[PDB]
Amino acid sequence: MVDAFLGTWKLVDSKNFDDYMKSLGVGFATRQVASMTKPTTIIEKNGDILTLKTHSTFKNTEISFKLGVEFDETTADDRKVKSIVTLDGGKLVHLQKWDGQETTLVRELIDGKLILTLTHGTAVCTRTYEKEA
Numbered sequence: 846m847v848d849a850f851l852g853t854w855k856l857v858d859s860k861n862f863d864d865y866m867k868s869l870g871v872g873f874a875t876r877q878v879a880s881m882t883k884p885t886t887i888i889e890k891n892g893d894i895l896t897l898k899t900h901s902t903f904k905n906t907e908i909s910f911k912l913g914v915e916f917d918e919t920t921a922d923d924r925k926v927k928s929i930v931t932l933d934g935g936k937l938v939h940l941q942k943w944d945g946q947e948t949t950l951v952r953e954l955i956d957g958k959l960i961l962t963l964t965h966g967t968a969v970c971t972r973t974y975e976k977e978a
């Protein structure tokens with residue numbers, strides 16, 4: 846159930862993140878900073894409002910949203926996007942759209958770990974998170 850996403854998650858593995866960021870036009874200097882920290886993601890809920898916080902040395906971000914209701918978002922890399930978060934079976938799907946393109950940030954729980962798959966065209970990144978106690 847949706848509740849299994851709630852809590853505090855720490856990055857423990859990454860594949861293809863530099864490649865995903867390059868695919869979004871993030872410059873090398875910014876990619877180096879973004880890749881050299883293990884971020885923390887906090888997923889919270891109050892009524893039908895979900896909040897996702899990312900804490901890192903690169904940027905702190907916070908978004909709030911209702912499932913299935915489009916919202917304006919300014920991403921960590923300063924893209925102004927049109928976003929929506931949905932639940933597709935066990936997948937919490939964050940879609941970002943801008944300028945005729947899109948990216949998805951998909952979260953799934955596998956063996957108690959939070960797997961974040963970031964897709965932008967042929968660039969696919971896997972970020973693996975573990976729950977903090």
Ligand SMILES: CC(C)Cc1ccc([C@@H](C)C(=O)O)cc1
Nearest residue numbers: 866869871879884899921922972
């Ligand atoms: C283009 C990038 C900078 C957008 C971005 C993707 C993933 C994260 C968090 C979840 C992360 O896993 O580091 C933060 C920002």
